[PDB]
Design a protein around this nucleic acid. Structure first.
Ligand SMILES: [Zn+2]
Lengths: 77, 64, 53, 99
RNA sequence: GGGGGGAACCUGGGGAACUGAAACAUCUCAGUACCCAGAGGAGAGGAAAGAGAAAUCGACUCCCUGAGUAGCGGCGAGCGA
RNA sequence: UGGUUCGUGGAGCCAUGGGGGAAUCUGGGCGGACCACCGCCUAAGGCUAAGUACUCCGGGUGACCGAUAGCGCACCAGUAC
RNA sequence: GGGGGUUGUGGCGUGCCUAUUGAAGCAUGAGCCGGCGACUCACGGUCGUGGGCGAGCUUAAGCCGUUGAGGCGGAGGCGUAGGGAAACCGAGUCCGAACAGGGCGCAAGCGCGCAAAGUCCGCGGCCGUGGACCCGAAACCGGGC
RNA sequence: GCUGGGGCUAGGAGUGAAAAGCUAACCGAGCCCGGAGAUAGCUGGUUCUCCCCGAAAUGACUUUAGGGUCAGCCUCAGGCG
RNA sequence: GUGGAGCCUGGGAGUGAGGGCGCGAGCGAUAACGUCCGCGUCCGAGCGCGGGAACAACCGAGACCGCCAGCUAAGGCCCCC
RNA sequence: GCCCCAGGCGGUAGGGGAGCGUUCCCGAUGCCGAUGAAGGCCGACCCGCGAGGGCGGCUGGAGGUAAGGGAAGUGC
RNA sequence: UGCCCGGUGCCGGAAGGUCAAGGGGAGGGGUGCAAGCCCCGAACCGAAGCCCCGGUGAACGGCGGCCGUAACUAUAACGGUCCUAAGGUAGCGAAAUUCCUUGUCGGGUAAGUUCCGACCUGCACGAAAAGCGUAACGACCGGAGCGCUGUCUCGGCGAGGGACCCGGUGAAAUUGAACUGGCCGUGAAGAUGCGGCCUACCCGUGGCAGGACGAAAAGACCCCGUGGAGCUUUACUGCAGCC
RNA sequence: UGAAAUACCACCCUGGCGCGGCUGGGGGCCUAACCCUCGGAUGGGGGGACAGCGCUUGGCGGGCAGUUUGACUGGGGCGGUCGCCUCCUAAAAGGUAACGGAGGCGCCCAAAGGUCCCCUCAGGCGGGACGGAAAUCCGCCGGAGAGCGCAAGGGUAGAAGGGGGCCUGACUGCGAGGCCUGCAAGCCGAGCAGGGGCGAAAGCCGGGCCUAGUGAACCGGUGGUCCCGUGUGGAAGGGCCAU
C-alpha cells in the first residue's frame, strides 16, 4: 500500500490583523488576504497581494456596504 | 589554555558598541535575475541578529 | 528558466556598465533587447543594450 | 552547535577583506582622543604625556576629536578632526600638527 | 679512541592510529605514541647571504608579552605564528 | 616534496630528491609572486660557555598519605604467584 | 524506677534503587557486614557577588629581600569613540547624489563629596580546551613475544 | 602412514587435501606493553540535613527521530508597577 | 482584578519517550488499555489521604506538624464495617 | 513596630537559600588530657527541625583541640 | 561437450579520433626610460590507456514471445509474426533442483506426503561452476525385504555402582529480606506479598519437578548506534603492482 | 597604361629547390659504459646506450588500505515520501498530526509588464449560403454560471476580463511602519530624493490578480569599482558593487 496524498503547503496566516476601534500607525498591515474580501477605503492602501494597510494614523473602521463589498477605513485621530 | 576566537564568526559578524551583533543580510550571493530591486536593495544592508543567537556568537568572540 | 528562456544583462550603451539583469525567451525575441533604463552611473535614463549575461 | 544542521553562524555570509599571507600590513594607528579629556591638562600637551596620562596607548599616533569644551591650549597631535580645529582654533587653543 | 648501560631530560633519522570534524577521505589528533641512531650533564641552537620598515636592530638560547593577534583552514573542525 | 601560520594559494623564505646549471664584488642573496627603485646581508666549512629541560640520586619542606592511603612494595616486592 | 523489653489481640499497611506513562511487581541491582568508590583542577570567557582603586585599573617574566616577609618590577592587558571591507572619518560614521532616509553610535546620576564608567582581586554559577562526573566496550595503530 | 628428536615459516602475517580451520585451552585477523584515562549521542551508579519555588514530555530545524540548537514551560537576581 | 500575578534585563535548568479520562475530529472496523490531532483535566511529579473491594489518572479532595476534638465532601448507614 | 498582622507551606526534573559532620592550615611555643585524649560499646538524659551536639556509664590507654575563619581526595 | 563473440575479459591491429608530461611559442600581459627581466600562453608535434577494427567460450556469461493450423476431439509435423548475439542441442527431467504438488500412472504396502520406473506442463535441468551412465569402494544419505531381537505391546525380576542410614572430611552455583497456601478478580495485562473468599497445628526426612515469569549467561533471533569488524564490487578515494 | 610603369638598383615576401649548421623522429651497425657468464678475471666472450635503476607524465590497477552506503516507518526490509502552492482534515481568530482525503510547482509573458482610452462575458432562443451541435452575422433573454497562461482556492465586469495608443517603473538610493515568525528566512509598504513612462490632469507606474515556479553559506567566474596593494611605485592578488 502506497499513497498519492500526504502533502500540504505551509500555513499562510491570513486574516484581519487589526480590528475596528483599534489604533494603528501608518504602514501597519490591516488585512492579510487573498483577493479582496475587504476592499481598501478611507486612508487604506492595498499592496500588490491585496494586503490592506494603514495609509494614515488613527482608528480602524470596518464597514460593509452590502453589494459594494466590505471596506476598511482608517479614520484619523 | 586561553580560549580561541571562532575565526569563522570573525569573518561574518561585527559586534557593535551596545553589545548588539551585526552581519550582512543573507540571500544575495547569486540567482538574482529575478529578484526585485527591493529585494537586492534591502538585502544589501547589515542587520542585528536575534537576541539568543547573537548572545552565543558573543560567546564565540571573547577577545572582541 | 530554460535553455530557450535565457538570462541576460543590460549594459548601458554609454557608461558600458551592466546595470540590470533580466531574462527573455530567445525563441520569441531573437533580438538583443534594448530599453531606456536609468543608468545610476550616468545618473539618467539611457538605452541599455541586451548583453549576454 | 545546532544538532547537526548548518549553524546560524555559518548560514551567514563572509563580508570584507579577511587578509591573506603574509598577513596584516603595519600602518600608523590613530588612537583618537577628545578635547573634553584634554581639559585635565594645562597649556601644551604632547602624545607622550597622553601616554603617561593613560589615554594615548603606545604605538599609536594621536588624533584629536571634537568632543567636549575646548581649552586655550597648545596641543601637538598627529591629526585633528575638522571640528577639533574648529573648537581649538576658535577657543584660543593652538592646534599644532606635528610629524 | 669506539663498542655497551644510564631514570627521566635533548636532538637527528623513521613515524602511526584511536579520536574531532557529532559520518568521513582534505585536515586534527601529531611530527604525538613509539622505533632507531647519537650523544651530555644536558642537549640542541648560536654569531646574519638575519630581522623587516624604523635608513631600525644587531649571534644564540630560555621566561613573560606580543596574541589567540597576523594568519592558515572541506574558510569547517580547528590550527596558529 | 618537507618546515614556516602558510592545506597550491598571488607563494615568497629555509631545505633538497631529480634535470638543467653560474660568477668572485660591477659577484651574489634577501625585504612574500614579478619589474624598477630604495635598503639589509654576504650562502654554499667548522666550533662556541652562559642563561633552559629532567630527576637515576643526596638534602630541605608540605592546609602531602597514614598500612584498602601512600610507590606495584613501610614487612626479605618487582617478590610469592 | 514514670519509663524500658516482648507481643496476644484488633486496625492499617503492595521492600529499596534505577529505568519508566506506568513497578509490590513475575523489569534491572544487591547474600550481609566493614573499608575504597565518582561533578575536580588548570588556564581562558561570561554572569553575579565581597571588597580596592576609579577615567582610570592593573602587572607578568624577572630582580631584590626572609627563608613562611614582602617589596620592586608599567614590559603588557583592559577601559576612555564609534562607524566603515577599507582607505578614512569622527560623536559621527556607513549606504547613498542627498544635508533624504535610515544602521550602528552620543548624551549617567545626587548633594566639592555622594556615586559611578571601568578595572584588580577573592568567592560562586555556567561555558571552552584539556580525561573534564565515575565504570564499561567491541575495536584501531606502533614496538615487540 | 604414524611417531621421536633437530629446525624453519606469524600476525593482515604463516600455514592450511580449504572448515575460514589452526597459529599456546575463546583466531572472519593472536598475545603483551604503549597511544590509552581511545570513543561510547548508550547502560548502570553518583554518598549529609532543613527550607522556598517548581517543570516538560510541545513547536521549528536537524544524516534527525531514544541525541541536539532556538522558542515554550521552572527558578533565581535586579528593575518597572 | 494586589496575584508565588504581569513585564523587562540578566544567570542556571530540566524538559523536547508521555499517558489516562471527557469532549470535537482523522485513521482504524463508528475494534483495541490502538494510533494522531485540538480544547480541558489528572497522573506524571500527588502509587500522600476518603470512596470505588482490590486499582495512576473514575468520584471527593491539594498531605507544614501535633491533639484519645468538632463539621462536611464523594460514598455509605443489615454484619464483616 | 525581638514581637505582632495577613497570607503561604504535596512535590520529581530542576533553580535558590540555610545548616550539620569528616581530613587538614590559622587561632596554637596556646588550651584539654594518667583525676584518662582519640577511639569502641551503651543511654529511657539534655540541645536542635534535621543533618548532628553535649552529657553521662563501661572499654581504651595518648593524644585532642575552641570560639572565628580558610582549604578539600569531605558524607555511600 | 550444441549454439551466441551482441556487452565484459583477454589476444591481435602502424588506419583513425582522443589523449598527459614534454616540446613549440602565434599572441597577450606586468614592469622598466630603456635596455632588459618576469609571467601567461594558441596552432602544431607528442606514449601508453581509451574509443575504434577484428578474434576469442574447457574466457565472463547468455541461450525468446505470441497467433494459426490435420479424417471426432485433442494436438500440431506445419506456417505467420515480433525480438535477440543467439534462441538450450545431446542427454536427462516432479530430480540433493517441481512452486502448483501428497501432480498422473505403475510397482511395492492392508494401507506408502517417503522409495523405484515411466509420463513431461523442466515455476526455475543441461553440457567442463560439465550432462548422461557407470563396476569397485563409502563409520555418506534414501526405500524395501529376511534373520534376530525388551525397540515396542508392556512390562517383570534379578546383579553390581550410586541414591537411603550410620561414623569422617565436606563444597558449589545461587541468595534484597522473608514469618513464602489455593481460587476468583485487580494490578504494567500471568500475584505467597493486593481484595473477597476458602484452607492451613510447629519442624522435619525421602521423592516428582508445576510454579517461584527458577538458575546460567547485560538474548546471539529483531531493531537501534551516523558502534566495529570480515568479505564483495563496473561504490569513492588512495596505494602496491604493472604499462 | 593600370586601382601600380618597366631598365637597372635595394628592403624584402612569395612557394620550391639544394648547401651547410643547430635540430627532432625513426631505422641499421659498432663498442668501453652499463647486464650476465666464462673455476682463469688490468682477460675473455654474449647484448648493446634499445635493458636495470632514478625523477616526474598519464593510465590499468578490490592485489591492498581507508572509508560511505540517509531518515521517516503502527518492528525493520521491500514499496512510498522527503522541498514549496492550493483545498479538507482543522473543532466560525490564527496554528494545528497521521505512510489522512484531493490536486499542483521546479515555469511562463519584451508582452501575459506600465499607463491612457475604449468595450463586457458564458450561456439559451429565434433568423441566417456553404455551415454543421458547435465557424462568422443579427436580434432577443444573462451579475457573471465566462474569462482572468498553467492546480485549487480566494478575488474580480463599477475588471483583475478583451482591444487599441504610447511607453519600459520588469526603475536607482532608500524607507515610516508593520504581518509572520525560535532563528534565519518570507511578505506588504506609505513616503522621500534622482531620473523617467503614460495622462489634460487628477493620478498611477519600484513587473505580472494573488497565493507555488525554488536553495543558506562557502569556492570560484565575469564586468564595474578604484578600497587594500606587505620598504616605495607599479603589478600579482584581493575587498566592495552587479552578477
Ligand atoms: Zn551608463
Amino acid at each position: 500500500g502506497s499513497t498519492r496524498n500526504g502533502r500540504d503547503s505551509q500555513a499562510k496566516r491570513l486574516g484581519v490583523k487589526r480590528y475596528e476601534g483599534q489604533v494603528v500607525r501608518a504602514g501597519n498591515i490591516l488585512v492579510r488576504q487573498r483577493g479582496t474580501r475587504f476592499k481598501p477605503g478611507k486612508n487604506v492602501g492595498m499592496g500588490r497581494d491585496f494586503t490592506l494597510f494603514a495609509l494614515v494614523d488613527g482608528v480602524v473602521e470596518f464597514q460593509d456596504r452590502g453589494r459594494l463589498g466590505r471596506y476598511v477605513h482608517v479614520r484619523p485621530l | 589554555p586561553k580560549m580561541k576566537t571562532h575565526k569563522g564568526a570573525k569573518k561574518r559578524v561585527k559586534i557593535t558598541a551596545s553589545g548588539k551583533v551585526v552581519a550582512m543580510k543573507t540571500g544575495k550571493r547569486h540567482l538574482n535575475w529575478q529578484k526585485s530591486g527591493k529585494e537586492i536593495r534591502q538585502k544589501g544592508r547589515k542587520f542585528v541578529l536575534a537576541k539568543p543567537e547573537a548572545e552565543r556568537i558573543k560567546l564565540l568572540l571573547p577577545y572582541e | 528558466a530554460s535553455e530557450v528562456r535565457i538570462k541576460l544583462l543590460l549594459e548601458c550603451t554609454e557608461c558600458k556598465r551592466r546595470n540590470y539583469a533580466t531574462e527573455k525567451n530567445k525563441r520569441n525575441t531573437p533580438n538583443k533587447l534594448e530599453l531606456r533604463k536609468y543608468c545610476p552611473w550616468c545618473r539618467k535614463h539611457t538605452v541599455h543594450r541586451e548583453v549576454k549575461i | 552547535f545546532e544538532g547537526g544542521r548548518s549553524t546560524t553562524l555559518m548560514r551567514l555570509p563572509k563580508r570584507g577583506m579577511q587578509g591573506q599571507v603574509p598577513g596584516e600590513i603595519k600602518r600608523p594607528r590613530y588612537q583618537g582622543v577628545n578635547l573634553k579629556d584634554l581639559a585635565r591638562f594645562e597649556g601644551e600637551v604632547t602624545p607622550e604625556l597622553l601616554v603617561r596620562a593613560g589615554l594615548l596607548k603606545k604605538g599609536y599616533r594621536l588624533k584629536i576629536l571634537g568632543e567636549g569644551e575646548a581649552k586655550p591650549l597648545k596641543v601637538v597631535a598627529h591629526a585633528f578632526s575638522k571640528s577639533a580645529l574648529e573648537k581649538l582654533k576658535a577657543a584660543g587653543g593652538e592646534p599644532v600638527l606635528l610629524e
